[PDB]
Structures are given as C-alpha cells and as structure tokens.
Design an enzyme around this catalytic site. Structure first.
Site, PDB file in Angstrom:
ATOM      1  N   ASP A   1      32.117 -61.234 -61.301  1.00 40.82           N
ATOM      2  CA  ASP A   1      32.911 -60.055 -61.611  1.00 40.82           C
ATOM      3  C   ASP A   1      31.897 -59.083 -62.218  1.00 40.82           C
ATOM      4  O   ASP A   1      31.428 -59.305 -63.348  1.00 40.82           O
ATOM      5  CB  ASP A   1      33.994 -60.387 -62.634  1.00 40.82           C
ATOM      6  CG  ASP A   1      34.744 -59.203 -63.234  1.00 40.82           C
ATOM      7  OD1 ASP A   1      34.566 -58.052 -62.738  1.00 40.82           O
ATOM      8  OD2 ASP A   1      35.524 -59.420 -64.188  1.00 40.82           O
TER       9      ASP A   1
ATOM     10  N   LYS B   1      29.057 -48.510 -62.968  1.00 41.29           N
ATOM     11  CA  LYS B   1      30.137 -48.723 -62.007  1.00 41.29           C
ATOM     12  C   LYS B   1      30.912 -47.430 -61.725  1.00 41.29           C
ATOM     13  O   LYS B   1      31.477 -47.255 -60.624  1.00 41.29           O
ATOM     14  CB  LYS B   1      31.073 -49.814 -62.507  1.00 41.29           C
ATOM     15  CG  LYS B   1      32.052 -50.301 -61.467  1.00 41.29           C
ATOM     16  CD  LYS B   1      32.783 -51.519 -62.013  1.00 41.29           C
ATOM     17  CE  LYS B   1      33.795 -52.072 -61.043  1.00 41.29           C
ATOM     18  NZ  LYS B   1      34.377 -53.307 -61.571  1.00 41.29           N
TER      19      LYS B   1
ATOM     20  N   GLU C   1      39.125 -57.074 -56.669  1.00 41.29           N
ATOM     21  CA  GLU C   1      39.390 -57.667 -57.986  1.00 41.29           C
ATOM     22  C   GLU C   1      40.828 -58.213 -58.112  1.00 41.29           C
ATOM     23  O   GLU C   1      40.986 -59.350 -58.518  1.00 41.29           O
ATOM     24  CB  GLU C   1      39.075 -56.657 -59.111  1.00 41.29           C
ATOM     25  CG  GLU C   1      37.593 -56.423 -59.278  1.00 41.29           C
ATOM     26  CD  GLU C   1      37.206 -55.140 -59.979  1.00 41.29           C
ATOM     27  OE1 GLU C   1      38.105 -54.458 -60.523  1.00 41.29           O
ATOM     28  OE2 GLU C   1      35.998 -54.816 -59.985  1.00 41.29           O
TER      29      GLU C   1
ATOM     30  N   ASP D   1      45.812 -55.158 -64.760  1.00 47.42           N
ATOM     31  CA  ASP D   1      44.441 -55.273 -65.212  1.00 47.42           C
ATOM     32  C   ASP D   1      44.053 -54.169 -66.175  1.00 47.42           C
ATOM     33  O   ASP D   1      43.733 -53.078 -65.744  1.00 47.42           O
ATOM     34  CB  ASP D   1      43.521 -55.248 -63.982  1.00 47.42           C
ATOM     35  CG  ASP D   1      42.065 -55.583 -64.260  1.00 47.42           C
ATOM     36  OD1 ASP D   1      41.664 -55.635 -65.476  1.00 47.42           O
ATOM     37  OD2 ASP D   1      41.330 -55.834 -63.287  1.00 47.42           O
TER      38      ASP D   1
END
Ligand SMILES: Nc1ncnc2c1ncn2[C@@H]1O[C@H](COP(=O)(O)OP(N)(=O)O)[C@@H](O)[C@H]1O
Ligand SMILES: [Cl-]
Ligand SMILES: [Cl-]
Length: 386
Positions: free
Chosen positions: A7, A68, A173, A197
């Site tokens: 991850d 990211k 994800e 999430d």
C-alpha cells in the site's frame, strides 16, 4: 518467487506478505507496521520513512511528502496549484510539464520527479520485507486509488520499476481492502460492499459489487482534502487560541516551527482520545520560551470536529445515489485508513447504516496492504489463501 503487497499511501505506506494462506504485515526497523511516505535530504544523508518524518520540523525545505498528490500529474493541473500551498518544499514545472521537486542534498541543489520520490518509499518497503524474509524480493502488487487515471497508474508502476520491483499488477485500494476480508470468496451471490477509507490526508468512499469472485467499482466519491491532518488542525487552531487567552494575546501561529511542534503533539493526543476519555497536549518552550499545557476531553475533540465527522456521510449518500441503491442494500461496510479508529466516526457510520456493524477486524491502516499481499500470492501461483 517471493511476491509482496504494498500500500503506497499518501501519508503512510504498508507492506505485507501472504504465505501458506495467511498474511503477515511486516514491521520496519523501529517496530512500526506502517512507514511514513516521507523522504528527506540533509548535509550528510537521504532519510526515508520514520527518520525522515521525525526531522521534518527541523528541515522543512528538504523533507518531501505528498508525492502521491503529484505522481502522474502535469505541474499545470489545478490540483497541483491548490495543493502546493500545503508544502514547505519547492515544486517547479519542467520543460516536459512534469513536476520537479527541488531540495538541497549534501550542499547541492537536486530535483526529482514524483515517481522518483515514490520509488524511494517503495524501495524502503521492499527492504523492510527483505530484512524480515532474509531474502531478496522482486515481485510486488502495488495499490492505487480507484479514481487514479492512466497517467497516475503508469507513473506508480514506473516508481516500482525504479525501486527494483517487478510490478505484477496495479490494483485499486478499495478492491484490495475487500479482498483482505475474503468478501470475494465468502459471498457466492451478489454483494454490495461499501469501502469507507479515511486516512491522513484523503477520504475515499467506494461502492463495489462482487458477483462470482469478480469485483466492480460501481461508484466513488469522497474528499481529497479531508483526513486525520484536518482533525489535528482543529486541535492546533484551538490550542493557538488557548495560548492567546493564557499568555496575553501572544500568537504561536506567527512562528512556523512552533506550529509544527504543536501539530505533532496534537496528533498524538488525538490518537490517545480514540481509546481514552481525555488527553494532554504539552509543548515545552512552545513560543517565547513559554511552556504550553492543556487537557482535551474526547467530547471537546468531537465538538471541534463535529461538522467534519458528520460530513463524511455526504460522500456515502453520494455513492449510493450514483449507484442507484438504498443503504439497506449494502452487505458489508469496510473501515479502512487510520482515522477510522475514531469512535465518533465508527458510531456515525453504524447509525447511518441502521446499526449494521462495520468490518474493522483488520487494523484499518493495514487492510489495503493485506489485500495486495493476498493478490500478489494469487498472481504468483499460490492458491493457499482461497
Ligand atoms: N488511534 C488513532 N486514532 C485516530 N487517528 C489515527 C489513529 N491511528 C492513526 N490515525 C491517523 O491515521 C492517519 C494516517 O492513516 P493511514 O491510513 O495510515 O495513512 P494514509 N497514507 O492511507 O493516509 C493519520 O492522520 C493518523 O493520525
Ligand atoms: Cl508470495
Ligand atoms: Cl520469516
């Protein structure tokens, strides 16, 4: 032969391995099961993970995080223009339109593409697995958000290749979190899965459908700027005002180092409040050599964050509306991201789903790596998890 699941998170990264049907989430050098997605450059060394995050307040200009948010983007994109206000490090556009992160390393100006920064985080996660296994690791499954476009996915794959990994597959994800709980195997009929999430910087809600071991992402929504760092900021803003009332109007926010030190202690107190009714925020010699101390009850933290917590349900309602389905049709609610440990958030989600208990047995900041590790084992020919 050996394949790991990674991850590659916005704020934290996690690595797992699935062997003999079971998943081990691998602790790093400091015993941490997740590693900050931070890279720092000093006069002598290049730090990655915990060591980089730990010296961020002392070396803000040369400590890189949030790569990211830049990976696979053109520098001219409006999201870059907006996000760059949050970064103490310099980001400029190259002649190819790619972002270039500028730092000083060993007294010299250096530039890196976002995928080069992410490759250093991936290399650290590869090494964390290698130290544990006592053997080299070449194969990996890396996860990306469901909304990542082709350019963001390809740049993430390139980051893997630069790190020395053979990327077996880039997977979503939310799908990785669902795979972690075996919702593809245990459910024979159609299953509607909601992935909630909430991490350190982003909030993603994804509605998946699973029919015959096949996951489809039906709808996604969220907020790319809502996460644990925003709850820490609510505590920071309160403490800044509390310091003013205690010390004749003195303003801590005028000193960026004072704010960073206060933010570090605010995040620690926030974590304590997930399992205790109270916590102390303490910073010795915070501003003007003045010590700062305050006690925060879970009720006060919930009050400061009330609107932000309640508004997490808005993207939940949005995905259900886009997918044309009622909340009663959701079979499983999976809690992913470190912020889902906040009791108030768990209660809000449970009440929204009419008392339905969410799936939270896997450490929420590990579920994505756990699922990626399962998928990496399957793609390596190991059917033991099934
Ligand atoms: N016990 C806890 N209670 C509340 N927040 C917690 C927590 N443990 C971790 N967190 C929060 O989780 C966030 C990081 O979540 P994580 O899921 O690991 O990171 P990421 N890269 O996916 O964004 C941080 O804001 C951190 O403060
Ligand atoms: Cl494997
Ligand atoms: Cl081992």
């Amino acid at each position: 032969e050996v394949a790991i699941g990674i991850d590659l998170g916005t704020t934290y990264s996690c690595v797992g391995i699935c062997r003999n049907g079971v998943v081990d989430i691998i602790a790093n050098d400091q015993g941490n099961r997740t590693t900050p997605s931070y890279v720092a450059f000093t006069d002598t060394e290049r730090l990655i993970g915990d060591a980089a995050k730990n010296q961020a307040s002392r070396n803000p200009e040369n400590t890189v995080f949030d790569a990211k948010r830049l990976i696979g983007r053109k520098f001219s994109e409006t999201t870059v223009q907006s996000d760059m206000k949050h970064w103490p490090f310099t980001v400029k556009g190259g002649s190819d339109g790619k972002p270039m992160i500028e730092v000083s390393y060993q007294g010299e100006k250096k530039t890196f593409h976002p995928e080069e920064i992410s490759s250093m985080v991936l290399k650290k996660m590869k090494e964390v697995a290698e130290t544990y296994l006592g053997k080299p690791v070449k194969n990996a499954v890396i996860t990306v958000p469901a909304y990542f476009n082709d350019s963001q996915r390809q740049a993430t794959k390139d980051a893997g290749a630069i790190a020395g990994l053979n990327v077996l597959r880039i997977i979503n994800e939310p799908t990785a979190a669902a795979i972690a709980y075996g919702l593809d195997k245990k459910g024979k009929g159609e299953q509607n899965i909601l992935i909630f999430d909430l991490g350190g910087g982003t909030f993603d809600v994804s509605l998946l459908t699973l029919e015959d071991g096949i996951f489809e992402v039906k709808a996604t929504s969220g907020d790319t700027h809502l996460g644990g760092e925003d709850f820490d900021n609510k505590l920071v803003n309160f403490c800044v005002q509390d310091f003013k009332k205690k010390n004749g109007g003195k303003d801590v926010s005028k000193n960026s180092k004072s704010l960073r030190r206060l933010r570090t202690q605010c995040e620690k107190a926030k974590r304590v409040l997930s399992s205790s009714a109270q916590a102390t925020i303490e910073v010795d010699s915070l501003f003007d050599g003045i010590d700062y101390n305050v006690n925060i009850t879970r009720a006060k933290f919930e009050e400061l964050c009330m609107d932000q917590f309640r508004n997490t349900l808005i993207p939940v309602e949005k995905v259900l509306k886009d997918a044309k389905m009622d909340k009663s049709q959701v079979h499983e609610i999976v809690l992913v991201g470190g912020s889902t440990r906040i009791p108030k958030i768990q209660q809000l989600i449970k009440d929204f789903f009419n008392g339905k208990e969410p799936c939270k047995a896997i450490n929420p900041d590990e579920a994505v790596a756990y699922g990626a590790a399962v998928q990496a084992a399957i793609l390596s020919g190991d059917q033991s998890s099934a």
